[PDB]
Amino acid sequence: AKAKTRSSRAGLQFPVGRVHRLLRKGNYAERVGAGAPVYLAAVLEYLTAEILELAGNAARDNKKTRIIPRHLQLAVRNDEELNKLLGRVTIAQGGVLPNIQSVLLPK
Amino acid sequence: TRKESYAIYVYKVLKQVHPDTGISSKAMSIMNSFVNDVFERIAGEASRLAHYNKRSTITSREIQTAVRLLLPGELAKHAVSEGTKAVTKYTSA
């Protein structure tokens, strides 16, 4: 019969066969269920969509039509939840968030 | 050669969310690394979670629990809701 992928019949875009393959041959457990790849693909897709939307917002805020590591840095550090999740990472070529202490400004 | 990427899937999600933008190569590599890192975090937490309960099977229950343990605040809630939606749609279909 004609074959349709688990990604399609699950509604997602991220791959489910690849996730299942990694979970199996990743020495995570002896035997792997049949809904875990779907759940993991859904979660990864959600996180990717969230950060990408914030990055696109920043990119258009700077009048540009291509997301760059600077915009990734800016979105991640301006959203507090993603900032906590990615608190310990350092996006390469991301620069720093603009900030000058109030005391340092002139009178 | 033949190195797996996630790049095409990231671009698919991008063209879904903002269907007029693009991604530079460095940004795409950064995003791929982010996906791999979060994947290995979730998988490791699920592995330890199954090992703690004398259980020898990764399944959606501890995938969900690992998601809830790692993602903070509203992220956990939204991700859990979306994961349950996807898995129920998959089993139904």
Partner: peptide, 12 residues
């Protein structure tokens, strides 16, 4: 409860 569309950021 179908959580949707959380506290999206404002400017940049």
């Amino acid at each position: 409860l179908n959580p949707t569309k959380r506290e999206r950021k404002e400017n940049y």
